[PDB]
Amino acid sequence: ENPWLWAVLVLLLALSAFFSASETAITTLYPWKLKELAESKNGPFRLLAEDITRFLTTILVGNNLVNIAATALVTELATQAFGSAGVGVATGAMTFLILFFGEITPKSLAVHHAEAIARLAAWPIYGLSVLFYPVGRFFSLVSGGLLRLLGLEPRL
Amino acid sequence: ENPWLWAVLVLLLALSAFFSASETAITTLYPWKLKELAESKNGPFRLLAEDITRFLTTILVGNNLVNIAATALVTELATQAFGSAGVGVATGAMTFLILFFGEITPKSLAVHHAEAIARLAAWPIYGLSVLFYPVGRFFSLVSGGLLRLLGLEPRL
Ligand SMILES: [Mg+2]
Ligand SMILES: [Mg+2]
Ligand SMILES: [Zn+2]
Ligand SMILES: [Zn+2]
């Protein structure tokens, strides 16, 4: 159990909180108060209002990525220490940690500070969007492709 | 690599889809069309409309649980086969699988079939709620407790 590897794990759960908090802060501000902060400057709120799907998508991708990442880390420690019971341990320990620290706490926190979080997250997320939004947008276009071939969605 | 252990993994990703689909189908129906299906009978729609937080909470808990669970499984195979590179492999492989099969496909699917999914999921989720909703509701009350002690939320 190296020291960095706990720090990495904490960085990751922080990132999950960052993503779940920013998701909440963006959507509670949307649309009216987002538009109102957008016509005033400056300046992240204009970027959030104008392309909001770009933002929520990156988040979905960034939130699952670091959630899965962090779980996969912890499982490697759980299984190196405890064998096949580590899967049990890690599922429990992580289900607690993503829920409480990467979801329920940040989301709770965001509704009380939507403007400051949104302002602080929009550029970092906009950066991670250079790569994540095409990935997410690709996934979805194939997803809905796969669906319509399968007749589970109106033909086109 | 046992055969059951792939089946378990698939069951889990199905469950994640079940949860992300039901989450979408419930909230796109809410509130007006949910109320309209609720005053007509019978009968899950009445249960969904009346205590909706009970439902979305179980889902949040059930979706993270099986997401983390399935990732922790796959990591154990990734690391038994590939050593410390398995964490890399599993994060990649799973981030693809939860996103595409446990999220982007089901959510896409649900908006086109909200009434049938909602009707079919409300009792199963209501069952899983006997246990998950107190857990989630506990998490949150401590969460907001922890927040107010820390002065990040209006005192009380
Ligand atoms: Mg999160
Ligand atoms: Mg899911
Ligand atoms: Zn104005
Ligand atoms: Zn009516």
- SS3 per residue for A44-85: HHHHHHHCHHHHHHHHHHHHHHHHHHHHHHHHHHHHHHHCCH
Q: Per the CB < 8 Å rule, is B78 touching A65?
A: no
Q: Which amino acid is at B149?
A: L
Residues of A in contact with B152 (CB under 8 A): 109, 112-113
Alpha-carbon span A146 to A135, nearest angstrom: 16
Helix (H, G, I), strand (E, B) or coil at A113: coil
Residue B138 lies in a domain: no
Cα A139 from chain centre: 16
Would you state the structure tokens that stand for residue A96, as one six-digit string? Answer: 């607690």
| Tokens standing for residue A32 | 């009216």
Q: Which helix (H) or strand (E) holds A40?
A: none
Query: Resolution of the experimental model in angstroms, please?
Result: 3.2
In a domain, A93, yes or no: yes
Q: Across the interface, which of B68, B79, B139 has its CB nearest the CB of A104?
A: B139
Residue B40 lies in a domain: yes
B42 labelled ligand-binding: no
Give the H or E element holding residue A124.
Answer: helix A114-149
CB atoms within 10 A of CB B47: 17
Q: How far apart are CA B11 and CA B106, in angstroms?
A: 15
Nearest to A128 by CA among A64, A59, A67: A59
Q: Is A9 on the interface with B (CB under 8 A)?
A: no
Burial of B137 (0-12, 13-18, 19+ CB in 10 A): middle
d(C-alpha A42, C-alpha B111), whole Å: 36
Per the domain annotation, does B143 fall within a domain?
no
Q: Which of B59, B68, B113 to mutate to test the interface with A (most CBs of A within 10 A)?
A: B68
- CB contact under 8 Å between A76 and B72, yes or no, is no
Is A156 a domain residue?
Answer: no
CB-nearest partner of B146 from A84, A105, A140:
A105
- Which tokens go with B142? 């401590």
Is the Cβ of B65 closer than 8 Å to some Cβ of chain A?
yes
Pairwise CA distance, residues B27 & B147, whole Å: 27
Q: Is residue B137 part of a domain?
A: no
For chain B, the straight-line distance linking the first and the last C-alpha, in angstroms and rounded, comes to: 53
* CA-based nearest residue to A86, from A99, A97, A96, A76: A76
Size of chain A, expressed as the number of residues it contains: 156
**Token duo for residue B125:** 């989720």
- CA separation for the pair B85, A108 (Å, rounded): 36
Tokens of B40: 């007509």
Q: Please indicate whether, in this complex, the C-beta atoms of A99 and B142 are within 8 angstroms of each other.
A: no
Q: Find the angle CA(B147)-CA(B148)-CA(B152) to the nearest 5 degrees.
A: 65
CA distance B45 to B29: 10
Tell me the residue range of the domain where B50 lies: 3-130
Residues in chain B: 156
Helix, strand, coil content of chain B in percent (nearest 5) = 85, 0, 15
Domains identified in chain B, total number: 1
Q: Which of A72, A62, A8 is nearest to B67 (CA)?
A: A72
Burial class (CB in 10 A: 0-12, 13-18, 19+), B112: middle
The answer to whether position B53 is within a domain reads: yes
Q: How far are the Cα atoms of A15, A77, B40 from residue A103, in angstroms, in the given order?
A: 11, 23, 35
- B21 closest CA partner among B124, B96, B90: B124
Residues B91, A69: contact at Cβ < 8 Å?
yes
Q: A40 CB near a chain B CB, below 8 Å?
A: no
Q: How far apart are CA B137 and CA B140, in angstroms?
A: 5
Residue A111 tokens read as: 């509704």
Angle at A108 between CA A103 and CA A111, to 5 degrees: 120
Which helix (H) or strand (E) segment is B104 a member of? Answer: none
Q: Which long-range contacts (CB under 8 A, 24 or more apart) does A12-16 make?
A: A12/A66, A12/A69, A12/A70, A12/A73, A13/A66, A13/A70, A13/A97, A13/A98, A13/A101, A13/A102, A15/A62, A15/A66, A16/A63, A16/A66, A16/A67, A16/A70, A16/A98, A16/A101, A16/A102, A16/A103, A16/A106
Instruction: With H, G, I as helix, E, B as strand and everything else as coil, classify residue B2.
Output: coil
Please name the residues in contact with B39: beta carbons below 8 A apart, sequence gap of 6 or more.
Answer: none
Residue type, A83: G
Residue A150 resides in a domain = no
Residue (of B44, B30, B34, B61) closest to B128 by Cα position: B61
CA distance B71 to B91: 8
Chain A residues in contact with B72 (beta carbon < 8 A): 71-72, 74-75, 78, 87, 90-91, 94
Burial label for B52, CB within 10 Å (0-12, 13-18, 19+), is middle
